[PDB]
Symmetry: C7
C-alpha cells in the first residue's frame, strides 16, 4: 500500500488465500507462501477451477504467466 511498491500487497497477503489469474484464462487459488519481483508465487494446497478433481500440495507459478492476483 506504499504508492511505489504494488507488490507489497502480496507481502500483506502471505498465508492468506489468493487467486492467481493466468494469461491463458486459468485460475489458481491457494495459500500464498512467497513471491518475488518477477511475480513468481508459491501456492500451498492449490486448486484449478478447471480440472477440479486434483489438488496440488505445493505449486510454484512462473510470474510471466500472470494476468493478475486477487487478494
Amino acid at each position: 500500500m506504499d504508492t511505489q511498491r504494488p507488490l507489497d500487497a502480496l507481502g500483506k497477503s502471505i498465508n492468506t488465500n489468493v487467486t492467481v489469474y493466468l494469461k491463458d484464462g486459468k485460475l489458481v487459488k491457494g495459500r500464498l507462501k512467497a513471491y518475488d519481483l518477477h511475480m513468481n508465487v508459491a501456492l500451498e494446497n492449490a486448486k484449478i477451477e478447471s480440472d477440479e478433481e486434483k489438488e496440488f500440495p505445493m505449486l510454484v507459478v512462473r510470474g510471466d504467466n500472470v494476468l493478475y492476483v486477487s487478494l
Copy 2:
C-alpha cells in the same frame, strides 16, 4: 507532465479510480493504490467490465499485460 517521465501521469491519479485496458480485450477498473516502473498496478475495489458483477477488494495487475491505462 514532465516530458521524460510519462508514468508520472499515474502519479497524478493515485487514490482515484482508473481504467486499465489489457491486451486480451479485458478492461480493469479500480482505485489506484500503487504502481512501479514495470507498470505493475495495485487496484482497490476492482471491477472487470467483462464480468461486471464481482468487485475484487484488491487486484495486482502484472505490467506486461497492460495495453494502455486511462487516467
Copy 3:
C-alpha cells in the same frame, strides 16, 4: 536529429498532435505529453480510431504495444 537517438524525434514533437500505431491494429491519436526510452507515451485528449465517440483526457500507452508512432 541525432543519428544514434531516434526517440529524440518524439522529444521534438511534445505538445503536437501524434498518432500511435499499436501491434493489434489500433490507432491512438492525441497530444504527446511525455515519453520514455521504453517508448511509453502519455497522450492528452486521446481518441482511438475504433471507439470514435469517447475521448480520453489522459492515456498512458505501454511501449511494447507500439508498432510505430507518426509525427
Copy 4:
C-alpha cells in the same frame, strides 16, 4: 519457506518427483536434479504424458516454457 523466495520450494524438492506443466499444455514429470533462477530445470528420467512411451534419462527444460511446477 522464506516469504521472498518462492523458488526455494524447488530446492526443498531436489531428488523428488515433480511435475512441470508447460505453456504448451505438455506435462513433464521426473526427478528434479537442478534448477536456476530462470526456472530452467534438470529432470532425471522424465516422461511427457502426451507421448507416454518415450524414456528421457536426462531432460533440461527452458524456464520460459514453464507454466507451473507441482511438487
Copy 5:
C-alpha cells in the same frame, strides 16, 4: 563493415532510403534518420505499402531491414 557490429550497416546508410520489414508483414520505406541498439529507427517521409513526414518505428517489431 566490422564483423562484430552488424548495425553499423544502418549507420553506413543514414539519410539513405531503406525498407523496414516488420513481423506482421508490413513494409515501411523512407529516409533513415536515426537508429539505436534496440534497432529503433526514425524514418523521414515514410510510406507503408498517405505519407508520414516522420515515422518512429519500435525496434522489436523489425523482421529485417533492406539497405
Copy 6:
C-alpha cells in the same frame, strides 16, 4: 549434477549426440559442440526429423526456441 546449475548437464554432453525439441514442434538431433547461458547450442551434423532429407554440418540454435533438450 550441481543443484543450482541445471545447464551443467549440457556441458557433460559435449561431443555427444543430443535431441533439441523446439517450441514449434521440430526435433533437431546432432552432436553437441557448444552452448551458452541463453541456451544457444551448436549442433554438428544435425538432422531435423521432420525434414529428413537435409543434413547440417553445422547448426547453431538460438536458445529462446528451445522447449527442452533430451540428452
Copy 7:
C-alpha cells in the same frame, strides 16, 4: 570449437554463404558479413527461398527472428 561460445561458429563462417531460417518459416541465405551477441546478422546478396525474384544487396536481420543458422 569452443564449448561455451556457440556464436563462434558464426565467426568461423563470415564471408561465406549461410542460411538463416526464421520463426515464420523464412529461408534467408546470403553472404555473412557480421553478427552480434543478440544474433543479429548482416547478409550480402540475400535471397528468400519464398520471394525468389527479388535479391537484397544488404539485409540486416533482427536476431530474435532467428530459428537456427546453417554453418
